[PDB]
Coordinates of all heavy atoms in Angstrom, one line a residue:
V1 N -72.2 -113.0 41.7 CA -72.0 -112.4 40.3 C -70.6 -112.9 40.0 O -70.4 -113.4 38.8 CB -72.0 -110.9 40.3 CG1 -71.8 -110.4 38.9 CG2 -73.4 -110.4 40.8
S2 N -69.7 -112.7 40.9 CA -68.3 -113.1 40.7 C -68.2 -114.5 40.3 O -67.5 -114.9 39.3 CB -67.5 -112.9 42.0 OG -66.2 -113.4 41.8
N3 N -68.9 -115.4 41.0 CA -68.9 -116.8 40.6 C -69.5 -117.0 39.2 O -69.2 -118.0 38.6 CB -69.7 -117.6 41.7 CG -68.8 -118.5 42.5 OD1 -68.2 -119.5 42.1 ND2 -68.6 -118.1 43.8
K4 N -70.3 -116.1 38.8 CA -71.0 -116.2 37.5 C -70.2 -115.6 36.3 O -70.6 -115.8 35.2 CB -72.4 -115.7 37.6 CG -73.4 -116.5 36.8 CD -73.4 -117.9 37.4 CE -73.6 -117.9 38.9 NZ -73.5 -119.3 39.4
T5 N -69.1 -114.9 36.6 CA -68.3 -114.2 35.6 C -66.8 -114.5 35.8 O -66.0 -113.7 35.4 CB -68.6 -112.7 35.7 OG1 -68.2 -112.2 37.0 CG2 -70.0 -112.4 35.4
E6 N -66.5 -115.6 36.3 CA -65.1 -116.0 36.5 C -64.3 -115.0 37.3 O -63.2 -114.7 37.0 CB -64.4 -116.2 35.2 CG -65.3 -116.9 34.1 CD -65.6 -118.3 34.4 OE1 -65.8 -118.6 35.6 OE2 -65.6 -119.1 33.4
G7 N -64.9 -114.4 38.4 CA -64.3 -113.5 39.2 C -64.0 -112.1 38.6 O -63.5 -111.2 39.2
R8 N -64.4 -112.0 37.3 CA -64.1 -110.8 36.5 C -64.9 -109.6 37.1 O -64.4 -108.5 37.1 CB -64.5 -111.0 35.0 CG -63.7 -112.1 34.4 CD -62.2 -111.9 34.6 NE -61.3 -112.7 33.8 CZ -60.0 -112.6 33.8 NH1 -59.4 -111.8 34.6 NH2 -59.3 -113.4 33.0
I9 N -66.1 -109.9 37.5 CA -66.9 -108.8 38.1 C -66.9 -109.2 39.6 O -67.5 -110.2 40.0 CB -68.3 -108.7 37.6 CG1 -68.3 -108.6 36.0 CG2 -69.0 -107.5 38.1 CD1 -67.6 -107.3 35.5
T10 N -66.3 -108.4 40.4 CA -66.2 -108.7 41.8 C -66.9 -107.8 42.8 O -67.0 -108.1 44.0 CB -64.7 -108.7 42.2 OG1 -64.2 -110.0 41.8 CG2 -64.4 -108.4 43.6
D11 N -67.5 -106.7 42.3 CA -68.2 -105.8 43.2 C -69.3 -105.1 42.5 O -69.4 -103.8 42.6 CB -67.3 -104.8 43.9
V12 N -70.2 -105.8 41.7 CA -71.2 -105.1 41.0 C -71.9 -104.2 41.9 O -72.3 -103.1 41.5 CB -72.3 -106.1 40.5 CG1 -73.1 -105.6 39.4 CG2 -71.6 -107.4 40.2
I13 N -72.1 -104.6 43.1 CA -72.8 -103.8 44.1 C -71.9 -103.1 45.0 O -71.1 -103.7 45.7 CB -73.9 -104.6 44.8 CG1 -74.9 -105.1 43.9 CG2 -74.5 -103.7 45.9 CD1 -76.0 -105.9 44.5
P14 N -72.0 -101.7 45.1 CA -71.1 -100.9 45.9 C -71.6 -101.1 47.4 O -72.7 -101.4 47.7 CB -71.3 -99.5 45.4 CG -72.8 -99.6 44.9 CD -72.8 -100.9 44.2
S15 N -70.6 -100.9 48.3 CA -71.0 -101.0 49.7 C -71.9 -99.9 50.2 O -71.9 -98.8 49.6 CB -69.7 -100.9 50.6 OG -69.0 -99.7 50.3
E16 N -72.8 -100.2 51.1 CA -73.7 -99.2 51.7 C -75.0 -99.0 50.8 O -75.9 -98.3 51.2 CB -73.0 -97.9 52.0
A17 N -75.0 -99.6 49.6 CA -76.1 -99.4 48.7 C -77.3 -100.2 49.2 O -78.4 -99.7 49.2 CB -75.7 -99.9 47.3
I18 N -77.0 -101.4 49.6 CA -78.1 -102.3 50.2 C -78.2 -102.0 51.7 O -77.2 -102.2 52.4 CB -77.8 -103.8 50.0 CG1 -77.8 -104.1 48.5 CG2 -78.7 -104.7 50.7 CD1 -77.3 -105.5 48.1
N19 N -79.4 -101.6 52.1 CA -79.6 -101.3 53.6 C -80.7 -102.1 54.2 O -81.3 -103.0 53.5 CB -79.9 -99.8 53.7 CG -81.1 -99.3 53.1 OD1 -81.4 -98.1 53.0 ND2 -81.9 -100.3 52.6
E20 N -81.0 -101.9 55.5 CA -82.0 -102.6 56.2 C -83.3 -102.7 55.5 O -84.0 -103.7 55.5 CB -82.2 -102.0 57.6
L21 N -83.7 -101.6 54.8 CA -85.0 -101.5 54.1 C -84.9 -102.1 52.7 O -85.9 -101.9 51.9 CB -85.5 -100.1 54.1 CG -85.9 -99.6 55.5 CD1 -86.7 -98.3 55.3 CD2 -86.7 -100.6 56.3
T22 N -83.9 -102.7 52.3 CA -83.7 -103.3 51.0 C -84.6 -104.5 50.8 O -84.4 -105.5 51.5 CB -82.3 -103.6 50.7 OG1 -81.5 -102.4 50.7 CG2 -82.2 -104.3 49.3
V23 N -85.6 -104.4 50.0 CA -86.5 -105.5 49.7 C -85.9 -106.6 48.8 O -85.8 -107.7 49.1 CB -87.8 -105.0 49.0 CG1 -88.6 -106.1 48.5 CG2 -88.6 -104.1 50.0
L24 N -85.6 -106.2 47.6 CA -85.1 -107.1 46.6 C -84.0 -106.6 45.7 O -83.8 -105.4 45.5 CB -86.3 -107.5 45.7 CG -86.0 -108.3 44.4 CD1 -85.9 -109.8 44.7 CD2 -87.2 -108.0 43.5
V25 N -83.2 -107.5 45.1 CA -82.1 -107.2 44.2 C -82.2 -108.1 43.0 O -81.9 -109.3 43.1 CB -80.8 -107.3 44.9 CG1 -79.7 -107.1 43.8 CG2 -80.6 -106.4 46.0
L26 N -82.5 -107.5 41.8 CA -82.5 -108.3 40.6 C -81.2 -108.2 39.9 O -80.6 -107.1 39.7 CB -83.5 -107.7 39.6 CG -84.9 -107.6 40.2 CD1 -85.0 -106.2 41.0 CD2 -86.0 -107.7 39.2
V27 N -80.6 -109.3 39.6 CA -79.3 -109.3 39.0 C -79.1 -110.2 37.7 O -79.5 -111.3 37.7 CB -78.3 -109.9 40.1 CG1 -76.9 -110.0 39.5 CG2 -78.3 -109.0 41.3
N28 N -78.5 -109.6 36.7 CA -78.2 -110.3 35.5 C -76.7 -110.3 35.4 O -76.0 -109.4 35.9 CB -78.7 -109.7 34.2 CG -77.9 -110.0 33.0 OD1 -77.1 -109.2 32.5 ND2 -78.1 -111.2 32.5
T29 N -76.2 -111.3 34.7 CA -74.8 -111.4 34.4 C -74.6 -112.0 33.0 O -75.4 -112.9 32.6 CB -74.1 -112.3 35.5 OG1 -74.7 -113.6 35.5 CG2 -74.2 -111.6 36.8
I30 N -73.6 -111.6 32.3 CA -73.3 -112.1 31.0 C -71.8 -112.3 31.0 O -71.1 -111.5 31.6 CB -73.6 -111.2 29.8 CG1 -75.1 -110.9 29.8 CG2 -73.1 -111.7 28.5 CD1 -75.6 -110.1 28.6
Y31 N -71.4 -113.4 30.4 CA -69.9 -113.7 30.4 C -69.6 -114.2 29.0 O -70.3 -115.0 28.4 CB -69.6 -114.9 31.3 CG -68.1 -115.3 31.2 CD1 -67.1 -114.6 31.9 CD2 -67.7 -116.2 30.3 CE1 -65.8 -114.9 31.8 CE2 -66.3 -116.5 30.1 CZ -65.4 -115.8 30.9 OH -64.1 -116.1 30.7
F32 N -68.6 -113.6 28.4 CA -68.2 -113.9 27.0 C -66.7 -114.3 27.1 O -66.0 -113.9 28.1 CB -68.3 -112.7 26.1 CG -67.7 -112.9 24.8 CD1 -68.2 -113.8 23.8 CD2 -66.5 -112.3 24.4 CE1 -67.5 -114.1 22.6 CE2 -65.8 -112.5 23.2 CZ -66.4 -113.4 22.3
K33 N -66.3 -115.0 26.1 CA -64.9 -115.4 26.1 C -64.7 -116.1 24.7 O -65.2 -117.2 24.6 CB -64.5 -116.4 27.2 CG -63.2 -116.2 27.8 CD -62.1 -116.7 26.8 CE -60.7 -116.4 27.4 NZ -60.5 -117.0 28.7
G34 N -64.1 -115.4 23.8 CA -63.9 -116.0 22.5 C -62.5 -116.0 22.0 O -61.6 -115.3 22.6
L35 N -62.3 -116.8 21.0 CA -60.9 -117.0 20.5 C -61.0 -116.3 19.1 O -61.9 -116.4 18.4 CB -60.6 -118.4 20.2 CG -60.6 -119.3 21.5 CD1 -60.4 -120.8 21.1 CD2 -59.5 -118.8 22.4
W36 N -59.9 -115.5 18.9 CA -59.9 -114.8 17.6 C -59.9 -115.8 16.5 O -59.3 -116.8 16.6 CB -58.6 -114.0 17.5 CG -58.5 -112.8 18.4 CD1 -57.5 -112.4 19.3 CD2 -59.5 -111.7 18.5 NE1 -57.8 -111.2 19.9 CE2 -59.0 -110.8 19.4 CE3 -60.7 -111.5 17.9 CZ2 -59.7 -109.6 19.8 CZ3 -61.4 -110.4 18.2 CH2 -60.9 -109.4 19.1
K37 N -60.8 -115.5 15.5 CA -60.9 -116.4 14.4 C -59.6 -116.4 13.7 O -59.2 -117.4 13.1 CB -62.0 -115.9 13.5 CG -62.1 -116.6 12.2 CD -63.1 -116.0 11.3 CE -63.0 -116.4 9.8 NZ -63.8 -115.4 9.0
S38 N -58.9 -115.3 13.9 CA -57.5 -115.1 13.3 C -56.6 -114.5 14.4 O -56.1 -113.4 14.3 CB -57.6 -114.1 12.2 OG -56.4 -113.8 11.6
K39 N -56.3 -115.3 15.4 CA -55.4 -114.9 16.5 C -54.2 -114.1 16.2 O -53.7 -114.2 15.1 CB -55.1 -116.1 17.4
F40 N -53.6 -113.4 17.2 CA -52.4 -112.6 17.1 C -51.3 -113.4 17.8 O -51.5 -114.1 18.8 CB -52.5 -111.3 17.8 CG -53.6 -110.4 17.3 CD1 -54.9 -110.7 17.5 CD2 -53.3 -109.2 16.7 CE1 -55.9 -109.8 17.1 CE2 -54.3 -108.3 16.2 CZ -55.6 -108.6 16.4
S41 N -50.1 -113.3 17.2 CA -48.9 -114.0 17.8 C -48.2 -113.1 18.8 O -47.9 -111.9 18.5 CB -47.9 -114.4 16.7 OG -48.6 -115.3 15.8
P42 N -47.8 -113.6 20.0 CA -47.1 -112.8 20.9 C -45.7 -112.3 20.4 O -45.2 -111.2 20.8 CB -47.0 -113.7 22.1 CG -48.2 -114.6 22.0 CD -48.3 -114.9 20.5
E43 N -45.1 -113.1 19.6 CA -43.8 -112.8 19.0 C -43.8 -111.5 18.3 O -42.8 -110.8 18.2 CB -43.4 -113.9 17.9
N44 N -45.0 -111.1 17.8 CA -45.2 -109.8 17.0 C -45.6 -108.7 17.9 O -45.6 -107.5 17.5 CB -46.2 -110.0 15.9 CG -45.8 -111.2 15.0 OD1 -44.8 -111.2 14.4 ND2 -46.7 -112.2 14.9
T45 N -46.0 -108.9 19.2 CA -46.5 -107.9 20.1 C -45.3 -107.1 20.6 O -44.3 -107.6 20.9 CB -47.2 -108.5 21.3 OG1 -48.3 -109.4 20.8 CG2 -47.8 -107.5 22.2

């Protein structure tokens, strides 16, 4: 998932959730990254 979201999501799945009897895991990922059509200047921040 991490590789699919630029490391932004690093632990979608909590530890101990997946166990010996875990059959399958369905996973979706969405990644967005846009530029403000009208960006802000750091000088003003």
Side-chain angles (χ1 to χ4, degrees), residues 1-10 12-15 17-19 21-38 40-42 44-45:
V1 180
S2 175
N3 250 289
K4 220 58 54 186
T5 58
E6 324 289 41
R8 298 312 193 177
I9 306 295
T10 277
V12 199
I13 297 184
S15 60
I18 294 176
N19 62 190
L21 296 193
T22 298
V23 168
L24 169 84
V25 177
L26 306 88
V27 176
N28 154 258
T29 58
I30 294 183
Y31 177 86
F32 169 71
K33 216 291 175 54
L35 296 175
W36 288 130
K37 172 183 163 198
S38 177
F40 298 71
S41 302
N44 306 299
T45 305

